[PDB]
Amino acid sequence: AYSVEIAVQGFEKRYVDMACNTLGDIIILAFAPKSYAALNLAFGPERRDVRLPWRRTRITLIRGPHIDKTGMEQFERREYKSVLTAATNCPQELARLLEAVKLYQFTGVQIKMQLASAQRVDLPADVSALLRXXXXXXXXXXXXXXXXXXXXXXXXXXXXXXXX
Amino acid sequence: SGEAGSGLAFPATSTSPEPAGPHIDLTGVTHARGKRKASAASVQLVPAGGAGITVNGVPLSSYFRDPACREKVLAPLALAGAETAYDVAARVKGGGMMGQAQAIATALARALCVQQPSLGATAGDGGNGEGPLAAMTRWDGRVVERQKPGQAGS
Amino acid sequence: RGNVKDHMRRMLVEQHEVDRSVFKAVTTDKSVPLEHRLQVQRLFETEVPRDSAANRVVNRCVLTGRARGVHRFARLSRIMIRQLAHSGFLPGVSKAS
Amino acid sequence: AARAAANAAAYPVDVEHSFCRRTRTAALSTARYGSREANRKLLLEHYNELLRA
Amino acid sequence: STWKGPYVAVSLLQEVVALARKHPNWWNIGQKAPEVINTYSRASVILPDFIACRFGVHNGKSFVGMEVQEAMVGHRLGEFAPTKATV
Amino acid sequence: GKGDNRTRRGKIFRGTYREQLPSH
Amino acid sequence: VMHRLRNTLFGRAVRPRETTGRRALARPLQGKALTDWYWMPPNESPGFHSEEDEYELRRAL
Amino acid sequence: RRREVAALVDAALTGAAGGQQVHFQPFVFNDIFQSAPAAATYVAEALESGSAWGRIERFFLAAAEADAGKLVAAVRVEVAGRIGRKADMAATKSWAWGDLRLASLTSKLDYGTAAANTRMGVLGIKVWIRYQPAA
RNA sequence: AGCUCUUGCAUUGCUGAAUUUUUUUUUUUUUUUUUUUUUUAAAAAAAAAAAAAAUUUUUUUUUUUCAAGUCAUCAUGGGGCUUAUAGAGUGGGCUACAGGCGUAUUACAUUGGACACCCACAAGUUGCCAAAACUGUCCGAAUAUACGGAUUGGAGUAAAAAAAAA
């Protein structure tokens, strides 16, 4: 019971496009029934490829070096986004995914990844006794992504708890 | 059904694109969309004597609450002469008040067009046609010109 | 120009780390000590390097020695930003619209 | 006499209790220690202390 | 600025304690304190008492001697060290 | 001042009617 | 008054504008942000082919 | 041998870069035309080296229709400064082959620059290049 | 080796100006017919016909001249400097104030001021937030008005919410 979200950031639409297509190839390979003989596949209708617009902000400059206050010119940064959606139930192929994105290097393009997943929780027996139903899936971990030699293939990975 | 391209690019100094159609849905309730500003709106038309007229949830006379703006809402409806008999269900987004009015006016016009073909303009026959309401179908997609990258300089 | 002298000022903000100064600032922003804040603030901003408070930094450019008209948008200064921009040796900042 | 609904403030840290009505879910987040697992330890203790109510 | 710590006069105070070898303010009410006091900074505030003190304040070109009296007690010393743009 | 000091209008001109968000 | 239970549950307090000195601790530190701002090579790269003196060599002639 | 030097340049980046290790990827130019500022620094390092302008523009033109119709559409090279022997006024000079449409935004196109420093003083060099659609 | 020392009439670079308008008329795809190069084949060439059309929120982009400006952006030719034209440290000054000039804002009210309103709808949900006004109420005496808000003194202060017991 694991859910994966991959967010992807770029400057040239070419590179974020190739990134989206190659990770889509990886997902479909990663849960691929390559042979019939074992038959719990997740193409449930959660699955998407949601595209996204950007953060419109223009940053302008003086053209001239000295007096030149007539001399303006406009400049501009672009960020292009996609999100990649899947989820699955066994962990060994999830590890194949994480090691797959560990190997294939992508040019100029940020990988931010969301991994909400189920993980079991010990309780002191007092609160289990004093239990005797809603979602309450609240871990939401957080990690840094810079100033320590990483050009941002950061993985964030909130967690979902279960203790009935 | 066979709808077609209805859109226009009427304006000066900045273009426009309202790619949304107007169409009748199988509930007997047509739906249409209209923007005349970058602020935008949609409509949904039921032939009914129920709640009457509705944008943004509320009855209209408190949301829009300048009278001139209210007849800017009602102007295609008053031009039609088919005022009462439809429930008017509608949604809006953006901008400023009578821009919302004339936008929702255009959308109401489009829904009325798919209700009655000859009153207003459509793409049923090659994106052409003529009725009293055919003038205000194609939206007036002029926006503000951009604040000039340059000087007052005076 | 003198980009490095400011780096020396930044290094003094961090060699005499700002934590020591700010912790003394904590006890002067506390109203809980009834007094002695005047004694704590009497020294401790004078024994502490006066050139290590965070206002003496002036945020110069890094390419050149620009001290005026800098940008934290991409850590450069306007004329260089334009030169690199037209060259395109910068992360995808194109002429706008 | 006007303020934004989303204060989105700063100069502090917390456990950020929050609820999402869209999916009927509570949300608590991590902020204190550098590593993720130390924060998992702190919020796990906070979850146990949450159930003392 | 009275909130959270209202007074700053540290170097002035070092010179004041140098004066305070027999009396800070004529405890031995005031007798002009003939030893000159010459500060090097005018950002200093003025503290209650401090009367009859010969203060020499810097103007950027020299030291300006002014005797303090009862009215200038709630002031900051730089108000008495101008740049002399008379005309 | 367009009623800069004491109005419900000129204090949006002096940036105070928008109360400043706590940031640093 | 229910948030008192949520408060003592979570140990929180009004963060801005109270003058109790806590804001100077809970503020983020700018010390990393101040010294990563510059970038100066030493003018003599220990690897090889230092350009900052090659320009001097070219303009010597 | 080679493989000492492979690891040497690879480590030379590696210790320089702080964190990561970085391959080295030399792909080499097979002319002076396929790049613009490569041609520009050929101009500037020529112009330091006492080349008179005529032999420069000679070798450029000979190389130009030596590679006629293949990868170069048009060449315009301008230099500003003092070029000659007794130039003392500020001046510029050039030459241009073919037609370039610098107003045409569908042009695969390039800009070049370089700088030279003669015995008189400093220079300015700009090179503008247009290509056929084989790219 | 270092200049914030000079020289923009020694310069590179970059820009100013109005030269304010021109940036669509041009190709490409397909068809038919035919011919140029190479020991089973592609381009090429030529006659004609039809369609596709020309980048971005719509401005940027293409443009001729002034020894126009800048050595204090860096650079750099020449000249100058090196008990000082080099660096620090502390405090000024870079913001001074007969006059005069340029650029803006705010008004001189009633189409308005004030106060409330719902706290009206935006640009702006991508990896929620206004004002003018609309609606209500107070004001119209050359009052310099309850318009206007410049100068000047003075001071840095209120609470509201609700719980348990007698």
DSSP state string for D21-44: TTTTEEE----SSSSHHHHHHHHH
Q: 10 Å Cβ neighbour count for A129?
A: 9
Amino acid at A106: F
Indicate left, alpha or beta for A157 from its phi (over 0: left) and psi (-120 to 50: alpha). left
Taken in order C52, C58, C61, C66, the sign of the CA dihedral is negative
To one decimal place, what's the resolution in Å? 4.2
Q: Report yes or no: A84 and A114 within 8 Å, Cβ to Cβ.
A: no
DSSP H/E element including G6: helix G2-10
Q: Looking up tokens 């926006």, which residue turns up? A: B143
Q: How far is F24 from chain G (nearest CA, A)?
A: 8
**Between G9, G10, G26, which is nearest D12 by CB?**
G26
Under a CB-based contact definition with an 8 Å cutoff, are residues A7 and A49 in contact? Answer: no
- Indicate the DSSP class of residue B102: H
At a CB cut-off of 8 Å and minimum separation 6, what does A130 contact? Answer: D51, D52
Cα–Cα nearest to C38, from B21, D52, E9: E9
With contact defined as beta carbons under 8 Å apart, do C44 and C23 qualify? no
Cα distance between residue H74 and residue A46, in whole Å: 55
Q: Protein footprint on strand I: which nucleotides are under 7 Å from a CB? A: 1, 4, 10-17, 23, 54-63, 67, 69-70, 73-77, 87-93, 96-97, 103-104, 106-107, 113-116, 119-124, 126-135, 148-150, 156, 162-163
The Cα B6–Cα A14 span in angstroms is 33
> Is G51 in a helix, a strand, or coil?
helix
Instruction: For residue A91, report the phi and psi dihedrals to the nearest 5 degrees.
Output: -90, -20
G16 and D9 Cβ atoms separated by less than 8 Å: yes
Q: End-to-end alpha-carbon separation of chain C, Å? A: 35
Is the distance from CB of H25 to CB of H39 less than 8 angstroms? no
Q: Which residues of A95-114 are buried (b: 16+ CB within 10 A; e: fewer)?
A: eebeebbeeeebeebbbbbe
Structure tokens at B83: 């005022």
Distance CA B112, CA B117 (A): 8
Handedness of CA G46, G52, G53, G57 (dihedral sign): positive
Element (H, E) at B104: helix B97-115
A48 touches strand I (CB under 7 A): no
For residue A1, the SS3 value is: coil
Determine A/H contact with 3+ CB pairs under 8 A as the test: yes
Contact residues for H71 (Cβ-Cβ < 8 A; gap 6+): H33, H34, H131, H132, H134, H135
DSSP string, C39-51: HHHHSSSSSS-GG
Is A68's CB less than 7 Å from nucleic acid strand I? Answer: yes
Q: Is the CB of A69 under 7 A from strand I?
A: no
Helices (runs of H) and strands (runs of E) counted in chain C? 4, 3
Name every residue whose Cβ is closer than 8 Å to that of residue H36 and which is 6 or more positions away in sequence.
Answer: H110, H111, H112, H127, H128, H129
Distance CA A160, CA A155 (A): 16
In order of E10, H39, H95, the CA distances from H74 in angstroms are 75, 14, 11
Distance (Å, whole) CA H37 – CA A127? 73
SS3 E9: coil
Interatomic CA distance for residues A12 and C25, integer angstroms = 47
Neighbours of F15 (CB within 10 A): 9
Q: Which helix (H) or strand (E) holds C9?
A: helix C3-15
- Residue B18 neighbours by CB distance under 10 Å: 20
User: What tokens appear for A73 in the block?
Assistant: 């010119």
Q: What is the C-alpha to C-alpha distance for residues A22 and A43, in angstroms, rounded to an integer?
A: 18
Helical H segments across H33-135, by residue range: 36-48, 53-64
Residue G13 neighbours by CB distance under 10 Å: 11
**Helix, strand or coil for residue H46?**
helix
Taking the C-alpha atoms of residue D13 and residue B115, their distance in angstroms, rounded to an integer, is 58
Could you give the maximum distance between any two Cα atoms of chain A, in Å?
78
Contact A100, A30 (CB under 8 A): yes
E86, burial (CB in 10 Å: exposed 0-12, middle 13-18, buried 19+):
exposed
User: Can you tell me whether residue H78 is helix, strand or coil?
Assistant: strand
Identify which of A54, C97, C19 has the alpha carbon closest to the alpha carbon of residue G24: C19
Nearest to A77 by CA among A50, A99, A54: A54
Parallel, antiparallel or unpaired: strands H74-81 and B86-93: unpaired
In sequence order, the β-bridge partners of residue A117 are A2
What does DSSP say about strands B86-93 and B53-55: parallel, antiparallel, or unpaired?
A: parallel
- H16-19's contacts with Cβ under 8 Å and 24+ in sequence apart are H16/G45, H16/G47, H18/A149, H19/A148, H19/A149, H19/A150
Experimentally, how was this structure solved? cryo-EM
